[PDB]
């Protein structure tokens, strides 16, 4: 059972979403990319038909527009079980105490 699962490879135009579909769906977080400023909504195209809505995502044309903060919250909050802390400075607090 597990032998077949592990042996199978990826990047062969797999049914629902491939690597390109995965990355463009990740780019789908356009709540600020153009929705907020340009006010232009995605052009809706109305198993393989599910990825027809992701072709237009390849028009990033720049970096700063995309919302990196949101994904930065997805990670370190949802997954990774992040034990993040403040990391307060110690050397400033230490006293010589001669």
């Amino acid at each position: 059972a597990q032998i077949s699962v592990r042996n199978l490879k990826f990047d062969d135009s797999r049914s629902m979403v491939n690597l390109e579909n995965i990355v463009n769906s990740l780019k789908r977080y356009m709540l600020k990319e153009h929705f907020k400023l340009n006010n232009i909504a995605e052009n809706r195209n109305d198993t393989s038909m599910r990825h027809s809505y992701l072709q237009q995502f390849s028009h990033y044309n720049e970096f700063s527009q995309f919302n990196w903060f949101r994904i930065g919250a997805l990670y370190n909050t949802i997954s990774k079980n992040a034990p993040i802390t403040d990391h307060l400075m110690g050397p400033l607090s230490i006293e010589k105490k001669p």
Partner: protein
């Protein structure tokens, strides 16, 4: 049942009181494991244990007992646990975490993630992004104010947030690329996000792409494969480090990928096995 919590607090208080060096060791671990957000080695643990015992002149406690006490106290107050890390040579040659004999460790909070509170987390983190860099600007001396985080906000730094987002997208690219991607190919895909590939420092992080990848490797998120070859040159491919394997679980990755594409929970079927098929042998399990 209700008194279980209180008796556990009393027990951990007795343990830490009887083991004063445990407090110092927990402080040092919680500090060093985050100063660089890197892995901690068994040799370093042994050295710090001996140094603390000699300084406090108390009999050197057993390593297993110290490890158990640290894990218990962290679970009680911080919820953190020092889960074991499989040896890096296992892949290059359910597994219970050999904490008593694992070579390396890393802090990890064991509190189970809820279903929708993380939604509030991400909403608070991302709400202000529209005004942090509105019109392509940025906070700092370049503007007359620096209180864009208000008195306080969940955005935290906005320097580590972008770093974590880049890490997540890099892992997503690598995980589903048959857990093997060439360095040049990785740069090519990353260029689709607008990151300068000419060597110029990126805007938010202020770090070059090559330096960013070097830091990522130094933090053990991804391990470089220096497959030197005369015909193909010094081709380098990136694998998933053991840190991510013991840090990004299969269920956590499934939830992440599901909520990136925003598919309804009803159609979660055929996804758990699909993700396992796509990842392949990225995990030593």
């Amino acid at each position: 049942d209700s008194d279980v919590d209180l008796t556990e607090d009393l027990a951990v208080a007795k343990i830490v009181k009887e083991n004063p060096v445990a407090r110092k060791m927990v402080r040092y671990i919680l500090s060093r494991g985050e100063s660089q957000n890197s892995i901690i080695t068994r040799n370093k643990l042994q050295s710090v244990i001996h140094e603390a015992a000699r300084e406090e002149n108390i009999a050197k406690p057993s390593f297993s007992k110290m490890f158990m006490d640290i894990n218990a106290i962290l679970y009680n107050v911080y919820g953190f646990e020092l889960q074991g890390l499989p040896s890096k040579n296992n892949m290059n040659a359910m597994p219970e975490p050999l904490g008593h004999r694992a070579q390396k460790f890393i802090l990890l909070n064991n509190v189970p993630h809820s279903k929708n509170f993380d939604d509030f987390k991400i909403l608070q983190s991302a709400h202000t992004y529209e005004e942090l860099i509105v019109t392509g600007e940025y906070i700092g001396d370049d503007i007359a104010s620096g209180t864009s985080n208000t008195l306080e906000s969940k955005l935290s730094t906005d320097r580590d947030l972008v770093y974590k987002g880049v890490l997540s997208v890099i892992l997503c690219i690598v995980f589903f690329s048959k857990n093997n991607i060439l360095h040049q190919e990785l740069i090519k895909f990353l260029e689709t996000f607008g990151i300068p590939s000419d060597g110029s420092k990126i805007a938010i992080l202020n770090i070059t792409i090559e330096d960013l990848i070097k830091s990522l490797e130094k933090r053990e998120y991804i391990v470089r494969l220096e497959e030197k070859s005369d015909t193909d040159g010094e081709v380098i491919s990136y694998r998933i480090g053991r840190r991510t394997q013991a840090e990004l679980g299969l269920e956590s990755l499934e939830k992440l990928v599901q909520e990136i594409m925003g598919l309804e929970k009803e159609q979660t079927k055929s996804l758990h096995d699909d993700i396992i098929k796509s990842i392949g042998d990225s995990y030593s399990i």
